């Protein structure tokens, strides 16, 4: 374990919301779809 410690070292924060914004666009498309449902009466 000491020699593996000496000779090995096993190494290895930002904004992204493309899934949340994809849900945003899907829910607003569903909202205008519900408006289109209410349009036919």
């Amino acid at each position: 374990e000491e020699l593996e410690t000496l000779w090995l070292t096993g190494i290895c924060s930002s904004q992204l919301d493309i899934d949340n914004m994809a849900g945003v666009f899907y829910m607003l498309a569903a909202a205008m779809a519900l408006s289109l449902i209410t349009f036919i009466w």
Partner: peptide, 27 residues
């Protein structure tokens, strides 16, 4: 010792147009 906000702005540009469309459509 950003671009997604511009996408949201284009989205609300769509929103205002479709709200005026529902204003004209719905009695």
């Amino acid at each position: 010792k950003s671009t997604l906000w511009l996408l949201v702005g284009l989205s609300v540009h769509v929103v205002a147009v479709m709200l005026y469309l529902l204003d004209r459509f719905s009695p």
